[PDB]
From a paper:
Laccases (EC 1.10.3.2) are multi-copper oxidases that catalyze the oxidation of various organic and inorganic molecules (e.g., mono- and di-phenols, polyphenols, diamines, aminophenols, aromatic or aliphatic amines) with the reduction of molecular oxygen to water. Substrate oxidation occurs near the Cu1 ion (named T1 center), and electrons are then transferred via the Cys-His pathway to the Cu2 and Cu3α-Cu3β (TNC), where the reduction of oxygen to water takes place. 2D laccases are homotrimeric proteins, with Cu1 ions of monomers lying in one plane at an equal distance from each other and forming the so-called equilateral triangle.
Based on our structural analysis, we propose that the side chains of Met 199 and Tyr 230 can hinder the access of organic substrates to Cu1 ion. In particular, the Met199Ala mutation nearly doubled the SgfSL activity toward ABTS and 2.6-DMP, and substitution of Met 199 to Gly increased activity of the enzyme toward both organic substrates approximately by 5-fold. In fact, Met199Gly mutation increased the kcat toward ABTS by 3-fold and by one order of magnitude toward 2.6-DMP, indicating that the SBP geometry change due to Met199Gly mutation appears to be more favorable for oxidation of 2.6-DMP than ABTS. The kcat of 2.6-DMP oxidation for the Met199Gly variant is one order of magnitude higher than for SgfSLwt, probably due to optimizing the substrate orientation in the SBP. The most active mutant (Met199Gly) was then chosen to create the SgfSL variant with optimized SBP and TNC. Met199Gly and Met199Ala mutations led to a shift of pHopt for 2.6-DMP oxidation by 1.0 point, while Tyr230Ala mutation shifted the pHopt by 0.5 points. The most catalytically active variant Met199Gly had maximum activity at 60 °C, whereas Met199Ala and Tyr230Ala have their Topt at 70 °C. In addition, the residual activity of SgfSL mutant forms after incubation at 80 °C for 30 min markedly decreased compared to the wild-type enzyme, except for variant Met199Ala. We suggest that decreased residual activity of Met199Gly and Tyr230Ala variants at high temperature could be explained by increased mobility of the Cu1 ion environment. The initial intensities of the peaks at λ = 600 nm of SgfSLwt and Met199Gly were approximately the same, but after the heat treatment, SgfSLwt retained 83% of initial absorbance, whereas Met199Gly retained only 60%. In our opinion, lower peak intensity is associated with the dissociation of Cu1 ions from T1 centers of the enzymes, and not with reduction. These data indicate that mutations Met199Gly and Tyr230Ala may break a well-organized network of non-covalent interactions that fix the position of Cu1 coordinating histidines.
Residue numbers in the entry:
A (entry chain B), B (entry chain C): 41 to 317
C (entry chain A): 40 to 317
Amino acid sequence: GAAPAGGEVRRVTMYAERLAGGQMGYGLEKGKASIPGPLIELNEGDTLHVEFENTMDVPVSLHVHGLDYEISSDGTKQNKSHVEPGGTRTYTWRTHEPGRRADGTWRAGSAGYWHYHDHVVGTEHGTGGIRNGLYGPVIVRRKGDVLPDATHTIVFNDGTINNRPAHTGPNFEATVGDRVEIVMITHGEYYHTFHMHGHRWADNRTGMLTGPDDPSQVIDNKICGPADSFGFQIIAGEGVGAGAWMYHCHVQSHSDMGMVGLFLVKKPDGTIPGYDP
Amino acid sequence: GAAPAGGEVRRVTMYAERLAGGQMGYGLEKGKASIPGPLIELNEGDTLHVEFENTMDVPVSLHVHGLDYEISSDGTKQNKSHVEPGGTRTYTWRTHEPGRRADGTWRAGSAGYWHYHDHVVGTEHGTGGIRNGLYGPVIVRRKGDVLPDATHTIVFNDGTINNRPAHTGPNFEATVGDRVEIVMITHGEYYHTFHMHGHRWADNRTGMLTGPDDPSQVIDNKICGPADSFGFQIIAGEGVGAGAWMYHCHVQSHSDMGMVGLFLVKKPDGTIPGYDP
Amino acid sequence: AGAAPAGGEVRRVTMYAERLAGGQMGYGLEKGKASIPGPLIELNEGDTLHVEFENTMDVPVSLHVHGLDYEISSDGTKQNKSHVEPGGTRTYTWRTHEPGRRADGTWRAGSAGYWHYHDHVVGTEHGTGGIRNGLYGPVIVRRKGDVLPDATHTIVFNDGTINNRPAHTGPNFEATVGDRVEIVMITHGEYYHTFHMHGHRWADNRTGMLTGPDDPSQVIDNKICGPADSFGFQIIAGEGVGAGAWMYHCHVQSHSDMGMVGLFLVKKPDGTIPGYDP
Ligand SMILES: [Cu+2]
Ligand SMILES: [Cu+2]
Ligand SMILES: [Cu+2]
Ligand SMILES: [Cu+2]
Ligand SMILES: [Cu+2]
Ligand SMILES: [Cu+2]
Ligand SMILES: [Cu+2]
Ligand SMILES: [Cu+2]
Ligand SMILES: [Cu+2]
Ligand SMILES: [Cu+2]
Ligand SMILES: [Cu+2]
Ligand code: NA
Ligand code: NA
């Protein structure tokens, strides 16, 4: 599968809602908010109209990295781009293809692994909102990009993965040979290093080398800090086989205190060697 | 415009001077020291003789990243290349173009976003001098590099931008369509993440993709540590329009305590929609 | 300079985990000769390595490698019981592969790069004690045609030490002007660092050297790194700058002030170093 050329005007509804235990999340339908928020996928050239509604009792906003937006969709109190309690607003995101500018230089396209998050809860930089769970992934694909069999989002938010209690994953399941896309986002106060056992990727836009001329370092460990985002695709078990393959932050106290999960790679018969749950 | 081939021998006078409040700065002329220090620009092949004078009552030095220098211009006490109080010294920086060696390998040129700083005030690694403001940017351009309409230097020094009081910018002004160059240097004890709203750049030498075959990640958020330097050029307002575009460190406590500033992008008539400080 | 050949050899080596002085712990290829960092392993893409491993200590230990191909039975974790009991033995197998076009037209990245191995089970189930104690070492996998160096030096930022040495004690590395010197740089523990080399620079890519005039990788002399990061590069000692005692150090200011410093001692042909007075 390959991404097509973009150019569609898409729309979606988004809600900010309180969740259990002081948390807050984005959802695409009322009562269905999650942490991380829903995955938004666009092709270069697509436009996205996000009909947003704040269902909480405190102001919230929606700020996006990487994509084109006018200052009116910045999502900050400073620009009156926030949403009052009960309020509604339409945030508009646009994307563009790469291309040669009139001045002769190459204009980078929108394609990449991006994310959106709150910018007004607790502070005017969204410190409380991000801590509470108001973040989500955005993928913009370029014409011809390889499409995956599954996509999984891993957010290192302070000392947690996806706001979960320590030592509770998440885990992700695949079958040997699956083409698996990982979106990796970092938030909060701390730097982290993301490590995946049994697998590696290229440190470039897609995480895949373009061919024999791409000099990007191939890695299995990557330092990241607050609001960094990257992504990659792997072939599950390629050259290594089935198994419970760990991923974790490699900062030693962070892995010891529980930012660890499993990439559960199954044989075609659905079983995982060496793994007792 | 485009950078010419280099090869000139250039001279400049530089002074280290005390500034108000225990600060120290470099300057091109007596009594005009600034933090950051003056921007030095060279073309690959140029030689620069810095006629240096220490107007201060403590030793100071000038150490440069990236450029060619002999051990006698290292700027360290260890090599006896510091400057005594009231003393003078000529620091020589050289640069070179890339090219094929005899062994067939490719020698990397000097071009890049670099910086200079003190190496002896407070400690033999310049911890006091750097804290006090003794740092500045150097740009070395390759023949053919695109030249910007303006260059702005942003230094994350511990918990400050350019040693400024918290919450005091700096702000930079441009018109929609301007080609704006940012030089980004980090110093001190902390890691940071630099983020720009509404704009993005390529993670490579120039900050611009060379063309459709360049696989560098396109980003708007970059982790950086002490003595890191990078730079890029953006088209102000490209695809997003005029506005007060924030830049800040994205480490949540840092943005909250005042590591924030504004990229004020004006329409040709001078208007900035919705700006209201 | 020499060039790496195509790989595909099947090799075997013995490795031991051993206690060292001061509560330290190290890997070695011969009994009683363990070192921190552990021995440098070098493979050409396509090679297979069978590590006949023996744990001579009184605690379970493991061998976990980054980047290379290994089956789950060579993961080196308690999770899948691939650690080594006290006094026990185990064969760990590492494989590597060349890059190539898959049948579906996508490009498979090869194994080549700067990698490392370390313990994963001493103290905690992530090897916090083992790594702190010194159980780490470098692995280089070369691609056919990679340029070969005159010498290779490994620098590990482990917590606030270099190579588990006492503060301010280097290590120093010696070269002659013109030498092709390879640096392998590994980070472990709890802290981020920035590695800086005076007088020298490299390209931020797989090999540390630009492939030619079309490579847009940033050329740098300073690089941020965190726990279990690894990278490497080659420089021509003294190129364009001459002989001297060229410092390298973490550039986090308090780390350089506390002793995360060392010297790249670049000598004239007559063996002397101008300005270097110890
Ligand atoms: Cu912001
Ligand atoms: Cu972490
Ligand atoms: Cu953000
Ligand atoms: Cu230094
Ligand atoms: Cu910061
Ligand atoms: Cu932003
Ligand atoms: Cu420095
Ligand atoms: Cu692990
Ligand atoms: Cu350090
Ligand atoms: Cu330096
Ligand atoms: Cu590891
Ligand atoms: Na790169
Ligand atoms: Na990087």
